[PDB]
Amino acid sequence: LVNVNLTKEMKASFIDYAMSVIVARALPDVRDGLKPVHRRILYGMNELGVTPDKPHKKSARITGDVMGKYHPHGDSSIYEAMVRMAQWWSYRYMLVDGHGNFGSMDGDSAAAQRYTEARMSKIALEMLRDINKNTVDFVDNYDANEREPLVLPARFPNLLVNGATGIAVGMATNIPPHNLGETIDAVKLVMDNPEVTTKDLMEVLPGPDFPTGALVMGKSGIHKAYETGKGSIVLRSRTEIETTKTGRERIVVTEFPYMVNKTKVHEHIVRLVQEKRIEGITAVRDESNREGVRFVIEVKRDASANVILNNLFKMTQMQTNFGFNMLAIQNGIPKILSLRQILDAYIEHQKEVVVRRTRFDKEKAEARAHILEGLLIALDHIDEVIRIIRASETDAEAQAELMSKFKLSERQSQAILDMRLRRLTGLERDKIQSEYDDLLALIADLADILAKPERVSQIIKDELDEVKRKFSDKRRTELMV
Amino acid sequence: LTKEMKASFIDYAMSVIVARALPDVRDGLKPVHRRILYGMNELGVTPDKPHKKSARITGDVMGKYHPHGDSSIYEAMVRMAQWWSYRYMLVDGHGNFGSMDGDSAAAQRYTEARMSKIALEMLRDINKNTVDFVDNYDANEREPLVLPARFPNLLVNGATGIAVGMATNIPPHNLGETIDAVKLVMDNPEVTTKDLMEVLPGPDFPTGALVMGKSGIHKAYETGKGSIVLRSRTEIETTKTGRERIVVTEFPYMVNKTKVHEHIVRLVQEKRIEGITAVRDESNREGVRFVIEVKRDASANVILNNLFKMTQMQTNFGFNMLAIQNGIPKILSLRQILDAYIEHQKEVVVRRTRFDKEKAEARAHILEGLLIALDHIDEVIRIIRASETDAEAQAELMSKFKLSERQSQAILDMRLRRLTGLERDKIQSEYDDLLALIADLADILAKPERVSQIIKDELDEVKRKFSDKRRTELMV
Incomplete structure (x- = not known):
């Protein structure tokens, strides 16, 4: 069978086994928290240029395209x-704009692979634009040729606020979600104020949010989990007693907390009927739910319906003991972070992002500056260089005489030599001079941004406010003590 | 639990390593490439017909197996x-493929290829039950895990692995030198490493370099570990105005000219020797003309040693030289490649002999029935006239003479054209021919050296058909 005798290669293959199973499935990353397959989806959708501007497209074709541009991995995940x-409904924020059959939230994952027709959302335009942006190393695949980026850089801790699902690999962890607006607020307060305290930002930060809209009670678990990310908290559904025209009372729920089925709990209600461990209950009904979710339990008189609500949030799954585990990974090794340290690593990432983008733009402007330096030096002593080309013979003689007379490089000399008559109007000569000084002003501006770091903070805050303008984030949940 | 996790670790690591790391000792052929050649043989279309321009081949490949990318x-x-990277030759093709330049041929199906000349005799004897098979995951077609060989391509094309535990460098060699090594180990089970130095003067390249060391080569062929020098060719000629002109044709392996030239431009332009503005490195479609001209008041050899310090015109090329066989990796030396290929060809030839005995003795049993039929005929005819059923006729023939069911029914398969006497002598002649060939194969099976002689026969076949010299000019 096995007959493998070398324990050393067993240990080495076992370390690669463990770390590769780590790397494969979902991880608390530095910059996106995502699966690498998510990164694959995004980078393929970007570099195919499939915008939401353009119309919809059959997406299983795109799936096979990305699968063929990448490794022969399995289709399932x-x-x-x-x-x-x-x-x-599941992820708090919108990424992929599907068009087909899914199942709403009640245990019917419709998997129509033929009908896989979709687009994306407009938030990847905020997520990543690294076309020219020297940011991330690449790994090569098909006989080691074609790029794949390591990480997903951004200007945005959106995926902090999204939530994570990486549990069964080694030890378990997740990321519970918040909303974005007060996140922007507390982040900008840390930006302009690098020495703030936790609880004063808990004054800025409400509870961990949910897309359905959850009733939250208690803050001791909030105190524990904003610090150390461990603990379960209690969650209740928006549930009311309503009187009829007859005086009969009705238990009416609006939504539920996270990871709840309507139908499995409904079967559990029918159990509780036939289990004969709860009384009073008459009608278990649910209709018109697509204009708005409306599930109604209706109970006879002389039953103490609020005590029955107490019995619901004691024994039924309507009560939610929602636990946290945010056990981080920063550059492979597993860690654990406070809410500050997340944003700190975000800050220094944005530092490196804007610095490297600015240096790429710097080298753009420097190269075009050397171009226009050569142009203007050609404009200096024109007829002498006319005599030069009327005299000399070769590339070597021309470059030697131009370097002796004007101290320029070879590419600069040849770009001089590539000047035609139709770029010899004094109009375009001074337009060259004008755009030359424009780029000089841009170089000086970027050097001034290199002088002080806080301009980066200010521009980040500006475009955070732009995103919060285009993406107003009202609340949906409710916190109590 | 954790033992089952260790089992998953072991089995999945074996899956990845046997998938995309080093291939078997038995072939030296990675299973991707193995299935490429197997499906291209099972295209059936000869290289004589003009080689095709289609992704239909690769579509049948991906129908045979689902990877994590058919672009791979x-x-x-x-x-x-x-x-220019992997030596002669595995593709009869026409389309864009570039050179060792930094070339990106995005035209995927637009290239042409089909079977190659070495592949033809390289993968014969499929019709002789030589190699075992396994079923795919698709439960519809089969595939072989190994291949039959007509040379150890292990030595012909090297290895450039990846570090799943560690990568592997294996250098290429020469055709006829490998043939002479096979003949040497065949004639003597008592060879030495100096014998290997004789029949292999050194590993070679499709491009060429210089390997100055000797004991690194010695430790390479013995220990399986060591690094060598790969050096560019250097030619010092005289400019008409007095410049020590350097001509370069050879290079270290896996070394593009482009980025090396760019770093040479950088090293010039970092407050160093700047008067060498002479880099005539072009016209490389006839060969390699990588020519610089050293400036005046400067010797060429100092700049040569400085670019050797740049590790691109002289490079410490290491070797890991590992292998996979019997589910285990292995540190390599010779008499391992050698004896493995020898006993593999022994397996192939002897199993071919057994299959040919199967066909020959089946046909001999047929012609037994034929000649015994053609002995006495008309009495059989008249007793058939005393019957009305082929089952009755079969029982009649079993009463008449000793036959098989197949023999009886084949004798029933006789029209009136079968009723002559010259064809009796013809069947008897081919019957004695087939008996002589069966006795020949039995005597060959009672001969160990005859197998080696058949190996010599196929070696001389491919040697008359092809040979190659040491293009890689190596001084030590």
Whole structure:
């Protein structure tokens, strides 16, 4: 069978086994927290240029395209994450704009692979634009040729606020979600104020949010989990007693906390009927739910319906003991972070992002500056260089005489030599001079941004406010003590 | 639990390593490339017909197996078209493939290829039950895990692995030198490493370099570990105005000219020797003309040693030289490649002999029935006239003479054209011919050296057909 005798290669293959199973499935990353397959989806959708501006497209074709541009990995988790980042209700924020059959929230994952027709959302335009941006190393695949980026850089801790699902690999962890607006607020307060305290930002930060809209009670678990990320908290559904025209009372729920089925709990209600461990209950009904979710339990008189609500949030699954585990990974090794340290690593990432983008733009401007330096030096002593080309013979003689007379490089001399008559009007000569000084002003501006670091902070805050303007984030949940 | 996690670790690590790391000792052929050649043989279309321009081949490949990308399968196609990287030859093709330049041929199906000349005799004897098979995951077609060989391509094309635990460098060699090594180990089970130095003067390249060391080569062929020098060719000639002109044709392996030239431009332009503005490195479609001209008041050899310190015109090329067989990796030396290929060809030839005995003795049993039929005929005819059923006729023939069911029914398969006497003598003649060939194969099976003689026969076949010299000029 095995007959493998060398324990050393067993240990080495076992370390690669463990770390590769880590790297494969979902991890608390530095910059996106995502699966690498998510990164694959995003980078393929970007570099194919499939915008939401353009119309919809059959997406299983795109799935096979990305699968063929990448490794021959299995289709299952691919199509799973394809659905998951198109599910509007599960992830708090919108990524993939599907068009087909999914199942709403009640245990029917419709998997119509033929009908896989979709687009994306407009938030990847805020997520990543690294076309020219020297940011991230690449790994090569098909006989080691074609790029794949290591990480997903951004200007945005959105995926902090999204939430994570990486549990069964080694030890368990997740990321519970918040909303974005007060996140922007507390972040900018740390930006302009690098020496703030936790609880004063808890004054800025409400509870961990949920897309359905949850009733939150208690803050001791909030105190523990904003610090150390461990503990379960209690969650209740928006549930009311309503009187009829007859005086009969009605238990009316609006939503539920996270990871709840209507139908499994409904079967559990029918159990509780036939289990004969709860009384009073008459009608278990649910209709018209697509204009708005409306599930109604209706109970006879002389029953103490609020005590029955107490019995619901004691024994039924309507009560939620929602636990946290945010056990981080920063450059491979597992860690654990406070809410400050997350944003700190975000800050220094934005530092490196804007610095490297500015240096790429710097080298753009420097190269074009050397171009226009050569142009203006050609404009200096024109007829002498006319005599030069009327005299000399070769590339070597021309470059030697131009370097002796004007101290320029070879490419500069040849770009001089590539000047035609139709770029010899004094109009375009002074337009060269004008755009030359424009780029000089841009170089000086970027050097001034290199002088002081806080301009980066200010521009980040500006475009955070732009995103919060285009993406107003009202609340949906409710916190109590 | 954790033992089952260790089992998953072991089995999945074996899956990844046997998938995309080093291939078997028995072939030296990675299973991607193995299935490329197997499906291209099972295209059936000869290289004589003009080689095709289609992704239909690779579509049947991906129907045979689902990878994590068929673009990687096309990368395997193209890397086996890299004659400048992997030696002679595995692709009869026409399309864009570039050179060792930094070339990106995005035209995937637009290239042409089909079977190659070495592949033809390289993968015969499929019709002789030589190699075992396994079923795919698709439960519809089969595939072989190993291949039959007509040379150890282990030595012909090297290895450039990846570090799943560690990568592996294996250098290429020469055709006829490998043939002479096979003949040497065949004639003597008592060879030495100096014998290997004789029949292999050194590993070679499709491009050429210089390997100055000797004991590194010695430790390479003995220990399996060591690094060598790969050096560019240097030619010092005289400019008409007095400049020590340097001509370069050879290079270290896996070294593009482009980025090396760019770093040479950088090293010039970092407050060093700047008067060498002479880099005439072009016209490389006839060969390699990598020519610089050293400036005046400067010797060429100092700049040569400085670019050797730049590790691109002289490079410490290491070797890991590992292998996979019997599910285990192995540190390599010779008499391992050698004896493995020998006993593999022994397996192939002897199993071919057994299959040919199967066909020959089946046909001999047929012609037994034929001649015993053609002995006495008309009495059989008249007793058939005393019957009305082929089952009755079969029982009649079993009463008449000793036959098989197949023999009886084949004797029933006789029209009136079968009723002559000259064809009796013809069947008897081929019957004695077939008995003589069966006795020949039995005597060959009672001969160990005859197998080696058949190996010599196929070696002389491919030696009359092809040979190659040491293009890689190596001084030590």
